[PDB]
Each structure stands twice: as structure tokens, then as C-alpha cells.
Amino acid sequence: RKQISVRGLAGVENVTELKKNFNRHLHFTLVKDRNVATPRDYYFALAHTVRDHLVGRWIRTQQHYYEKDPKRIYYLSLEFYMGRTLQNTMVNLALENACDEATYQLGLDMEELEEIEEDAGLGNGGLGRLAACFLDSMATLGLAAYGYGIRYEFGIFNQKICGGWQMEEADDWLRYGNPWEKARPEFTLPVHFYGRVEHTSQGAKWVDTQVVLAMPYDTPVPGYRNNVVNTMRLWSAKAPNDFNLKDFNVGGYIQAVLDRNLAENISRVLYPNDNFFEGKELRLKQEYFVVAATLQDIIRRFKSSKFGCRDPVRTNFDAFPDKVAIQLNDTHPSLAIPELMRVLVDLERLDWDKAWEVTVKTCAYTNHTVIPEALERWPVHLLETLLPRHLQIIYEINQRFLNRVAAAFPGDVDRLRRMSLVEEGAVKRINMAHLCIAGSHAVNGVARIHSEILKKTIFKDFYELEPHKFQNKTNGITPRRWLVLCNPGLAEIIAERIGEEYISDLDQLRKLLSYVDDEAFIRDVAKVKQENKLKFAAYLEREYKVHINPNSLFDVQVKRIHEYKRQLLNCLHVITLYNRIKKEPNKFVVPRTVMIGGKAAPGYHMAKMIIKLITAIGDVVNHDPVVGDRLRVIFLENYRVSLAEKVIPAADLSEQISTAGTEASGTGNMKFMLNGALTIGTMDGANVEMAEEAGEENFFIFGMRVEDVDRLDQRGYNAQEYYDRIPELRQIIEQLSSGFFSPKQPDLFKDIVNMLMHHDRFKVFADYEEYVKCQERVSALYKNPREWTRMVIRNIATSGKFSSDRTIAQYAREIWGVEPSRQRLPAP
Amino acid sequence: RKQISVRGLAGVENVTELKKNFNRHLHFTLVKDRNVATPRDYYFALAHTVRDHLVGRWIRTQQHYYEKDPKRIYYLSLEFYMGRTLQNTMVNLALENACDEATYQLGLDMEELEEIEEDAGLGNGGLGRLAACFLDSMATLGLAAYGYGIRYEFGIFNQKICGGWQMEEADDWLRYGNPWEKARPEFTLPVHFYGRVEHTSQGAKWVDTQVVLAMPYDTPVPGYRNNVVNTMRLWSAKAPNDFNLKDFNVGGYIQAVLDRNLAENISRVLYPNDNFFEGKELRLKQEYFVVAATLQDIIRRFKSSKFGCRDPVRTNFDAFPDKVAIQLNDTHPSLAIPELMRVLVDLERLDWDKAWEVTVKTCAYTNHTVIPEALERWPVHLLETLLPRHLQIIYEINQRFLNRVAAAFPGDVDRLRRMSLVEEGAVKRINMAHLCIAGSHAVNGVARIHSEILKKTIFKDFYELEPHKFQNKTNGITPRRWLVLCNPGLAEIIAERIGEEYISDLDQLRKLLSYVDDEAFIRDVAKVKQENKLKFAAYLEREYKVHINPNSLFDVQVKRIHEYKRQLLNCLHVITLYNRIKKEPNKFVVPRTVMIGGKAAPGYHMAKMIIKLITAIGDVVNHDPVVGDRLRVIFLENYRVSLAEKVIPAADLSEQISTAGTEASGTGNMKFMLNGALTIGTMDGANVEMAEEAGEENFFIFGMRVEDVDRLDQRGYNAQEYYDRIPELRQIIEQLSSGFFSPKQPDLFKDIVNMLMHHDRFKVFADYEEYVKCQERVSALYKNPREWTRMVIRNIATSGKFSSDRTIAQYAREIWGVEPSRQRLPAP
Amino acid sequence: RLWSAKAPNDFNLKDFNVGGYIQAVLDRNLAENISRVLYPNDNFFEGKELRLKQEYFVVA
Numbered sequence A, B: 001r002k003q004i005s006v007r008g009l010a011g012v013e014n015v016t017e018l019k020k021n022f023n024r025h026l027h028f029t030l031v032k033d034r035n036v037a038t039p040r041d042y043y044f045a046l047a048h049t050v051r052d053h054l055v056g057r058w059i060r061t062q063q064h065y066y067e068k069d070p071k072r073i074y075y076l077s078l079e080f081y082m083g084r085t086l087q088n089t090m091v092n093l094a095l096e097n098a099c100d101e102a103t104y105q106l107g108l109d110m111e112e113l114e115e116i117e118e119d120a121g122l123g124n125g126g127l128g129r130l131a132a133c134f135l136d137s138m139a140t141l142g143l144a145a146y147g148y149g150i151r152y153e154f155g156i157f158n159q160k161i162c163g164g165w166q167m168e169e170a171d172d173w174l175r176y177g178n179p180w181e182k183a184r185p186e187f188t189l190p191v192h193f194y195g196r197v198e199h200t201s202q203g204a205k206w207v208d209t210q211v212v213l214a215m216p217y218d219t220p221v222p223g224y225r226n227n228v229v230n231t232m233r234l235w236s237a238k239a240p241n242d243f244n245l246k247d248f249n250v251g252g253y254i255q256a257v258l259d260r261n262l263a264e265n266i267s268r269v270l271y272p273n274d275n276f277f278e279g280k281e282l283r284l285k286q287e288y289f290v291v292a293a294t295l296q297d298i299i300r301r302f303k304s305s306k307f308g309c310r311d312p313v314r315t316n317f318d319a320f321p322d323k324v325a326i327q328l329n330d331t332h333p334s335l336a337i338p339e340l341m342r343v344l345v346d347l348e349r350l351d352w353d354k355a356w357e358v359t360v361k362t363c364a365y366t367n368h369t370v371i372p373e374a375l376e377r378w379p380v381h382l383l384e385t386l387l388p389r390h391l392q393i394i395y396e397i398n399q400r401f402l403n404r405v406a407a408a409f410p411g412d413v414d415r416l417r418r419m420s421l422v423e424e425g426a427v428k429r430i431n432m433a434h435l436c437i438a439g440s441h442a443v444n445g446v447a448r449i450h451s452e453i454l455k456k457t458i459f460k461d462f463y464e465l466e467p468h469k470f471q472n473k474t475n476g477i478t479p480r481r482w483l484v485l486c487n488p489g490l491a492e493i494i495a496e497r498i499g500e501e502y503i504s505d506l507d508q509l510r511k512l513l514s515y516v517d518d519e520a521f522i523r524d525v526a527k528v529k530q531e532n533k534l535k536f537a538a539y540l541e542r543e544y545k546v547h548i549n550p551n552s553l554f555d556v557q558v559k560r561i562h563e564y565k566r567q568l569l570n571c572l573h574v575i576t577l578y579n580r581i582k583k584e585p586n587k588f589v590v591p592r593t594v595m596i597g598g599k600a601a602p603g604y605h606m607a608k609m610i611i612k613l614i615t616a617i618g619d620v621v622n623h624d625p626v627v628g629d630r631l632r633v634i635f636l637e638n639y640r641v642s643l644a645e646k647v648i649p650a651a652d653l654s655e656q657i658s659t660a661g662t663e664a665s666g667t668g669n670m671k672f673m674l675n676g677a678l679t680i681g682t683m684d685g686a687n688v689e690m691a692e693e694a695g696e697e698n699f700f701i702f703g704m705r706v707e708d709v710d711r712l713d714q715r716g717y718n719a720q721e722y723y724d725r726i727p728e729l730r731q732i733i734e735q736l737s738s739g740f741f742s743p744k745q746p747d748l749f750k751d752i753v754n755m756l757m758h759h760d761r762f763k764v765f766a767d768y769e770e771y772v773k774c775q776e777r778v779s780a781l782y783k784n785p786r787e788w789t790r791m792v793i794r795n796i797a798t799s800g801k802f803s804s805d806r807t808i809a810q811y812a813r814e815i816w817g818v819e820p821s822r823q824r825l826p827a828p
Numbered sequence C: 001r002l003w004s005a006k007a008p009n010d011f012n013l014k015d016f017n018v019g020g021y022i023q024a025v026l027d028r029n030l031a032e033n034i035s036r037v038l039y040p041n042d043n044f045f046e047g048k049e050l051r052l053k054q055e056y057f058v059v060a
């Protein structure tokens, strides 16, 4: 009753008040004292001091939307890669200063506690950091969004290099809790699995089903310094704990021991695809899961939150596409369409046609691949076993769509078998991308070139039938995470001259273009990067060692360690560089520290191998007494978002070298721009729009473009060919297989040899020379320490297109329909 | 650091602050608001407002101990039937009136809230209540006592009577958590199973073990206003979790699903004793589990808290007993004795005889078996496989104990094969009770005749080698749960009169003796009890339903449903009574409400059947219009501590009707005296010492005493001889078998007629008459309200022998060697 | 002379091990299918324990 209210509960900004709230939590929540507490307790102590402050806002923020009924847009994804949370909550919440002070007074080093937190083993690749860039921008722009994905116990693995080879341990990030989550067993929901469909008078029943319980953990995610805080809703699988007797099925036998290990084990570990080992009923089990749970919430909350009031069409969902917006990341939530159709046709009774009008006005799908054999597809043998009613709902969807197609092109019967959701073959499957296009009103590519590719090759019949459903939205980066916390200095001078305004529409960063020439800009920013690198060459010594140099050119590549990313390009050129500098030692050469981070994909052998070669490379060069301090090669173990927040600022040269048109977008790309790095790269994916902003002058675009790559396909790329012109290349395939870079196991990199000389799909030897040589244009510029630094501001001013802020206001305005407020919301 | 302190985080006792905490927790902790909260969220919130008060003290107490270094007593038992914690945590802390005001003003009903808490499914009987009453009285006379047990996730069922038949639903008490516990990931231990004993040169080695990990959770136990709060540590079982790689034995097979199933379910479920269905390895596995984990937490705390300062003799376990006390409640924690031997001889490195002296001075057994064949015994085939290092030490201990018997009884070669701890027969068994007598420096029975017979019959040869070990300690009860909080009514008046002093020692209630004849008191006492019976009829007619006339005499029996608890005797006298009212209707008959309650024990049949007997019996008399409201029968469903707390204060007669020489003591008994009720009952165990305190003249002792049992046994028993003497026994036997209580199934109760007629081990019929004579004396009294109550007074003022505070101050001085202080520790 | 695998058939008690779990079903199916199936070489799907299990068996 109203004495119970939010109006009082924290004094905020006093150190003071903060030190009392560290004093309560440490003693009363953690129930540890001053004498037996430990650093991990004291970070847990502080997390609660700030979370106090988050949920304050959260509650307000949330009840804001009950009485103000706004459109609620859900960002449905099965990977969400949030990383560290304490610093971020401080900047968005301003408390950082206070927080510091308070723990400095309380006699505790705040940074020493900040690396006691670990990343949310929750996501994994780029597409994760992507919904974690969008989450923060969504809130910021006043937008009512909840993000639903799964909560993973084990995230996805941890990388330890062992004797060269990638060794994977496991992330139980939650071990000792995670303070920012609030689990919720009151809102548990039963997800059905397997079953049987009886069609009777009023509808079909999907009877006899095993069930997995799904129950929700909420994390709040704040806006930037306007006091909105949003709901990340995570699911967790639970085997219904009804074992000794329930259904009086067991007496003699437990297979239930396995229900309670194959139900539960849905949210255990993340599998990320475009790999995995075999399209396991477990991945489809997770994708069905996340969607059944998530949709129940969506309807609980359309009918509830004053829509028992705002009814007015038998709670008919005509109000639904007006109020709800489901945003389908990749094909992985695609079951959201058949399921929304199940719920609606079966469970309420909205005749198929209304609830399909409703479905496509609610749904929208974001494409992330460039290549068509890699679009997800699932076999009718699996959807029939497992999700049978759904299979039926897909066949009868496709009935009708392919009629839509039959009215449209009488007699093109081959397009009728080019549009279908069932791809007849060796084995008959459903193409899950073609489902999304048919139940979403708006499909977008994720970068410029990339949607032109969806429109005129890949989805080109679809675009011909319904042109009006395709769009573009170039992915962004969030300036908070990727400017303010990951480089504080670099945001000080920017506001020191240009002055904050920008961190919520990054385009003002361009003003600092008009500020190039100043002879201080140029020596200051150099100091900053020269601040940052020292710090990294400490990391590269103290907690993971080597003998780096600060003074050096900082050659960074942190990608997925797949083939098509050319990590090997990088290695031919390092050994290039090491061979010359072995021939004429006494020779001035703008030297570098080469750094390659990534994880491989367990079981992808080539990628396991490449890392070994990149480490091995390292024992050899980095311990040779004639290279001295000239080349350095560092494999970056356990690359991840919080290692990314530090590697990106020491880095000079952002290597973005993937074979032309393989990458469909590119996000590491954008952070690498905003913190001042020079970006050598093919015209691919994202370096395209970066180049058309920063201007071609300022980049290191090179290599065989798409045109050329598709022409070396009509011509049969013969590799041994370059082998024979280039004496170096001869000489570096040479040393590898000879046994140079591995005298205890010479033969070893024979694999890679035979990949490169003979079966190289991605055309390494073809882009060699024009790359070796393009590098000599950057090794040009980093002798002349002034001009290097001149390029750099000119890259940096340009960057405000690479704002999640942007990427979001567009989604917001053009699909979601909602207009992105920048309003600071009230609140205690 | 030092600014980081407890000192004054609570505004403590201000509605002004407490409301504001039921407001931080409902919002910041729970993370709900005024809008979205359920009752539960508020009982949850209140729970946390109290809990702060609670842990401040707990912190102060435990650091208090660190500084002073007193003897620590550790209480191992396998059950703690705590019951509810809110209202008991508030009276031991005084908060009831501040927490009421406070919730009342935010407009929340404090008692509604209290019915949200579920009883800890951690106990299951008279043995688990004993342990949590000693635990209250251990905090109250300030003893540094930890309690140690298993933290069962699912209790041991909730009885729910479906169709007359008991149906057992799981009790996941923790379903929505439990707020009082703070789990400790930090100090998780291994519990090594199976494996192999290697004999190296310095000693044994237990190798190749399978390992479960025991992880602690602690609850706090507030003392009554003396400001101490001690620890209670429950061990949750936890399978090691690196399932996808370890030892690189997987890839191929998971039978390891069963580790994480059979390690995990060591804590899901209780297995309660002298029964069960078959002496399973799980039983014994729970048992070794709580010990292995605990003697590590016990030697940890011993090595840590100031013992190399307190070393003196190489921290020697010479000085271990000054600082440790180990209470093996029943044989279940017996393995405590080869394990403390195992660690000190194998791990540490004393010799046997040194570890032996230190073992027997540290453990003390307590016994609850009045009779012999229930006495715990494990098969050595069953200990070899699982516990091989420990089998060896029990063989060496048996060997060495026997040498002492021969030294003492030269040539008594049959005493040797009695005093042995290894039994031979059908299968070779180890008798775990003789194993406790050899590792305890004391053995104690829990009643005078109980503790007498342990000495004269049960363990007689042992008594003869070792007088200084056997002793008696009669069970007691706390006046806090069981007077102050179950019935505050009778608690006010006893202080307007003799005034609070008494709660900290019950003997002052004798001061009320002189008040037999004040006529205020006498009608106050009675008004008090009526106010309870009336309260109690509100439950019976509300949250369950019937027509219990509030004014009638309340007959209650709430013991375990068993053959030897005679709830049959009771039903025969009830259907008798039925018959007589029906017989001679318009008569004066002194009317009753017979309420019988108890949980059967699944896989026992006479017990499951008797429950249907009392439910049907009722269903008749409880609708028969010629009876009106002269009789009711009610089966109290799902008997637990918070139904006890409700029935004991309302009850008028307690039924303690055992067959003489079957009970050892009985704590319920005692709870019935203090709540101002009368007692018909046979002269068993506790009733002996209960009666000599109040004088025989105020109990209703009826029936065969022990001596008379042995007489009907030597001379030979024959129920049809009683049957032939008593025409009223034909009267209901007839009635039972004819089908008068079983409309759809006559012959159904033939199992009981038949048994009663030829297989009543307990002589129901032999006690039929003195019982139904003694009960005609009982109804007498209820017609004379003045004297009924004068009987009530010489009972309430005489209870003093029966406080757990008595029991415990004796345990402390004769066995444990600590002097119970009553000093208030000052604390916030 | 050709060989067929056969697990020891004492399956309810023998080793004084069971009355508890039967995992033990699996020797009588992972010994049993040592001779129930060719696993033909320079292929197969993964150098399973079962083929090494079979080479030793015909040899021993």
C-alpha cells in the first residue's frame, strides 16, 4: 500500500552514503565480516552497492510503460555477449567517481576489484556483442525493449594455450553467483517437447508431450545517463522434478535420469554454429525452447499490462501488431513464426488468416550471412519427431505462400521450387531463412553491400515478389563501452575540445576533423596511445608475459580463427619480415609487435593447426638473438570482450584482411576505428562504408576485390604459379615444410602447406604480394610519427555512422515504428 | 578495512527504520514493487527485514568466539525439524511488536504473512525436534555450538489424504528459496567414496576414490534475548561437474549420468530410520557424507582458530578435546568415530593409541532405543565396497577392545562374542552401537527408565567393563517455541502473576503453585485455553472444514501412526462412545472432539490402513444426526511443527497411550503439560518422570504397567479371553467386521479385525478396560470447570524438569565440560 | 577358428556389487557387440574404442 513505495531508498552520490551501502551488503548480504572477507567478496560487496541504484531506476522505468502503454519491441536472440558489468553500470549511472573515492577511502583499489568480475559466459561471437551493443543503445534512445535469449551455465569455453595448441577449459562464470541477475521462479513456464497431434472439431491437440521447465532470470541494462534501465530476461531449463513416482511410469526404470540431464542440459552450454558437430536435436532443442518461453511472456504481458483494459477487439490481437514487435536475430529464433501461429490458431481460435496477418505485422528478421550453403535448414525427420504440430503449420504456411507465388508468376514452375520452404534433396529439409522472409514484414542485411547481395542474388525471387519487405541497417558499435570505458583519455581530449554531446549521437566527433593540424593534437593523442600501449605491454609482461616493446607499430588481429579470415596472410608476411631482417640485419625497419587473438572451433583441425603455427612462429622469431627487439609475435589467449576493451586501445594497425565479399558487415572494425587505428583491409563487408566516410585516402584498402575473386573462379586459381614468381614465397612455403619452424616435428605444418599450395579455397597466395607491399605503405607512415597521427584523427572524426545509436534509431523509426526519444527520465 | 564495520547499520528497532527496510527489500532485494508484489513477496520482504537484525548479531557472536576461544561443541544428527523461523526469530529478538506496527501501517496483515512460510522439510519426527530444541537452549545458555546435518531439498513428504487414504506429495520447501540460509561455495569439501587401501611404508592410502563434493549452507539460531546467535551448517551434496572431458574416459560412456544423479540425490530425500526398504547404500551413503564433510569443517576450524598459538604440543590433538566436543545423536553419525581415527592416524600422523585417546575423549553417544532389534547395523559386505579404509579401522578397534575385555574378564569367552562389534549369523554385520560405546567417553539414555534399561539389559556387559560411560539425561523442551510462541495467551498471565524471569528457566513456573486458589487466575487460565480452542475451531472450519463445537472437550493424540502407539485402542473407545450415545441418546454425555493426527510411513500397511480407519469412523459419527455434536472425530492432516503450534494450546486431554515398555521418552508429552492440558496415559518412559513431578494425583495413569506385560507374556496372551470377558469388545469388533464402517467394502478392515483377534503384539484389548474406566474419570472433570483448571495449574507449574535448558545445562557439565553462561552479549 | 564375444552371465549379484545399479547391462552389450558388427577400416566414424576393442579380442 502506498507507504510501500520507491521514494526513499538510496542516498546516491554521497561517498558517504555509498560506504554505508558497501557496509551493509558486505556484512548482511554476503554475511562475511571485515576480518574474513576476501577480494571476490568485496567486489560482490560493491556490485550490490551499485545494483541498488540500478534497480531503483528499473522499477520506475518499468512501471513507466504500464500506465504509458508504449510499443514494446523484443530483441529475440540466442547469444547475448555482455562481458564485464560493474564499470559500465558506473558510467551510465555516473557513480564512477563516487564509487572510486568511496572504495579508495574504504581502503580498496576499485580497478583491483573490477578485474574480479568476469564476462557473462552468455554469448560468444560478434553477433553476440552485437545484441549487447544494441541493448545499450536501445535503452539510451528511450526505447521500450526487453531482450530475451538463454542463460548458459557454462557459456561457451575458455582458452588456454598449451604447448602451442589451443586448449579449451570451461567457463562456469556463475560459480560464486552473478549479483546482477535476479532469478524469478514465480514466472516459470512449461515448454512442450515431442508429442502427437490429434485434429478434432475445434482444433488440433498436440498431446502426449515430454515437458522442460523454463524459468527466468532478469538482468537490468541501463540507458546512458538519462535513468532508464531495461529488462534483459534470460531463460534457464529445469527438468520438472517429479521423479520417484510421477505418472507412475518409474518403478523399475530410469531413463528419467536422462530426461533430467537432456532437459536441464538445454541451457547448459552454448553450441554456435556455422559449425558444431552435427545439427544436433540439442541445438534445435535450444532454439525451440527460447522461443516457447519468450512468446508466453509476450502474450502474458500483451493481455495483462492494461490490455485487460485496452482490449478492445476480444483482446484480439489487432491491438497486438500495434503494441508488440518481435526482432528475429538470424534464423535461430525462426520458430517464433510457426509458434506464434500455433498459440494463436490453436490455443485462442483466431482463424488462420487473421493470425497470419497478425504474425507478419509482428515479425522481422536480421540476416547476417553472405553465403547460401550456410543459411540454416532443419530436416523434416527432426521437426516431425520433435515439434510435429509446428511441421504441419510449416507445410500449410508454404501451401499458401506458394499460392501467393502462383498468382504472381503463372507458369514459372521452377521458381515455385525455388521459393519453397522444403528443399527436396539427398534429404528433405526446411530452409529456415525462407520461413523468416514469409512471416516477417521486413528483412534486412546488415551492411550496405550486404543487403544489395540479399536483393539481387541470394533472396532475389523473394525480393521480386515482395520488394517492399527488404531494407538495410549497417551494424554499429556503442560509443559508451567502446569509447568511454575502453579509452578514458581518448574521450577526455575529445570533450576537452569538442565537448560531450556526442556520446549519444557520435557524429559530433567529426568536429575534431576541423581540429587536425594543431601541433598539440598531434603530440597529445600520440601520448594517449603511448599511454595505453605501456599499460598493455605491462599486461603483456605481468599477468601474461613476453618482452614487448612500447615503441613499436601495433599489428592487431582479433577475429574468429577461421580460414577465410586469412590469419595465415599475417603469418606469411611476419616471416617475410623476419627473413629480410635476417638478410641485411643492420637495417632500419619500422618494426612491430604482431598480436593475433582468437578461439578456433573445437574440432576444426585446420583452425586448431593455424594457432599452433602462429605460436611456434613465436618461439622461433621471438627468441632469436639477431632479430633482438625487432619483430614480436604474440598469440592472444582467451580473446573475449573484456580483453577486447584493452587490446583495441594499444593498437595501431587494425588488420581486416578477409577474402573479398566473405564478410557481410564488421563490428570489431568499428571499435578499432573510434580509438584511433589505421585499418589495412580488402574492400569487404564493413571496410566498404568506413572507406566511403573516412575517405579512401586515409585507409589501406588493398587486394583483389570481389570482381577479381569471382574472375579467379572462371580461371581456376592455380596457386603454384605465384609460388614460382615470388622468391620469398617460394622461400617461405620452403622453410615451413622443410621443418624450419618446428625441428622436433618438421612434417607438421605440411597440412597447411598442402592447403596453401593446393586446395586453398580462400586464395592466400593470390592476395600476397599486393598485401606485403600495402604494408610497406603503412611502414611508410609510422616512421613519420606526425603524419601517422594526422591520418588517425581523420579516421576518428568520421566514425558516427558506427554508432549503435544510429543503427538503432533507424530500426526504431523505419520498422519498429517507434520514435527514439533522447529524454532523460525522472527518478530516484 | 576498519571503517568497514557493523557498528550501527540498522537504525535497528524503529518502525521508523523497519518499515523502511521492508521497503528496501521489497524493491531493491526482491526486486518487485507495490504493484507487482504477491503475499509471498511481502512475507519474503519482512523475512529479510528481520534477517538483518539476525545476522548482525551472528557476525558479532562468531567473531566473539574467535577472540575468546571457548570449547566448541558440534551436534551431529541427521534431521533438524526446525519448523517455521519468522515468529520464532522475532521473539528471541523482541521485534514482534515493532514488526507488527510497521507491517500494519504499510497495511499488511502480519499474521497472514506468517502463514506463507513453509516448515523446513529437514526434520521428520521426535528425534529431529530434540535437536532443534537443544539447538535453542544451546544459544540461550550461551554455548558455542554448531549443529551439523544434511540439507534435504525435498523434505520427507506432505501427507494428503486422498479418499481416506494417505497420499504422499513431495515437499519442496525450497521451491521459492529459503531466505534464512546463506550458502557458502567457499568452503566446499570432498566426500571420498569406494576406492582402495594402498599400504605404503609410512601408512595406508585410500586411493582410487569417486568423489562427491559436499558444500555447506548455514542457517542462524538466535538465542532468547541474550543476543547470541549460533551457526547451523547443513551440507548440500554436489556432483563434480567437468562432465565433457575428465580423466578422458568419456567420449564413449555415460553411466556418469548416474554420478551426477546418485551423488546429487544423497541430498534430495530423507530415508528415516527403523524402517526404510532395505538397508541401502544410500542410507549409509548420506550417513558417511555428513560425517566426512563435517570432521573436515571441525578439524578446519580447530587448526585455524588460534591453534599454533594454541598448539602447544604440535597443535596436538593432545589438546583437541579442550576445544572440541562431538555429540553422535543416535547411531547415524557413528562413522564419526572410524573417520576421526582415519584422519588423525592416516592424514595427520599420530599413532593409533594417541588418536584413540583423543577419539574417545571427543565423541559422546546419545541413545533413543528403548528396545533392542532396532539397533543400527551395517553388513560388512556393504562397507567393504564403499568404505574400505574404514572397514579396516573398525576391525582393528574391535580387536583392541576385545583385548581389554579379556584383561578384565579373563576366560569369559562368550562375553567376548557379545561385546564384539562384528556380528556373525545369516550375514556378517558390524553393530554400529558397540562402535559408538568404544569411541565415546559417555553413553546417555534419554529418560530414567530408558537409561536404566540401557544399563541393565541392552548394553549390560559394556556397563560392567565401563560404569563411567553410562549416564542419563531426560529430554526437555524449549519454553520459547513451546509456550511463548505456540501460546502467548497462557504466557501473558503467567507473567502478570509471577512475571518474566521464568522463560530463561522454567522452574519458576512452580511459583504459580500457590495460585491454585486465586479465582482470577483459575478463570483466566480457562479463558486463555478457550480463546485457543475457538482459534483452533476457526482453522478446522476455515482452511480445512467441519463443525467442531468450540466448547467441547478436545481429546488429541498426535504421535506417529503405528501399531504400538495404540491409535486403534483410541478408535475402539471412540466407536464404543459412539455406540453408547446412540444407544441411550438423551443422556448426559460430556461431549468431545477427538482429533488424531500423524504421518503413516509409506510401505507399512497396518499404519496406512489405521488412517483409513480413523477417517471413515469419523465420516459416520460426523454426519449421524442422532449424535448432534456430542462427538466428532477429525484426522489432523499433515502433522508438522506448525500444526503442533496450533493444536497443543487448544487441546484438552493428551493421549499418551503406548503399551508399557515400548517408548523411551517422548517430547510431545511434555509440550502438552506446559500448554495447560491433561494427560491420560500408560506408565511409559517420560510419563514416569512427568507424573512424579506433578504427582500421580493429577495425571490419568491408566493401564498395564511394564511388570504386567511380562506377566501376560510368560502366562501367555489371548485376545479372545479379553474378547470374551468384555461384551463391549464384541460390540465394536463385530461392528468393525460386519461392515458398519465400510459401506462400499465390508471385509476391507478384516486385516485389522483379524490381526486384533490373533496377531496383536501390543495387547490393545488388555488395556481396553482400565482405559475406558480411566476415561469415565476424565469426562467427570470436564463437567466441573473449577477443578479441571486446578488440575491444569498443578501441571503447568511443575513442567520445570522439562526444559531443553535443563537437559542441556546437564549435558554441558557432565559430558561436554562447559559451564553454561547466561550473559547477554552486547551487540548491535 | 572364428571368435564371438559373450559377457559373463551372472548379472544379479556376482561381485557383490548389485541390487543397486545396473550399469552392468552395458558389458552385456559392449562385449556383446564386439562381434556383432564389421567396422571396416580406412573410414568409420571415429577411431572408436570399439575397433581397438575388437583387434585385441581376435588377437588375445
Ligand SMILES: *Cc1c(COP(=O)(O)O)cnc(C)c1O
Residues within 6 Å of the ligand: A125, A126, A129, A558, A559, A560, A639, A640, A641, A642, A644, A666, A667, A668, A669, A671
Ligand atoms: C566487438 C567484438 C568482436 C566483433 O567481431 P568482428 O568480426 O571483428 O566484428 C570480436 N570479439 C569481441 C569479444 C567483441 O566484443
Ligand SMILES: *Cc1c(COP(=O)(O)O)cnc(C)c1O
Residues within 6 Å of the ligand: B081, B125, B126, B129, B558, B559, B560, B639, B640, B641, B642, B644, B665, B666, B667, B668, B669, B671
Ligand atoms: C515435539 C514434536 C513431536 C514429538 O513426538 P512425540 O512422540 O510426541 O514425542 C512430534 N511432531 C512434532 C512436529 C513435534 O513438534
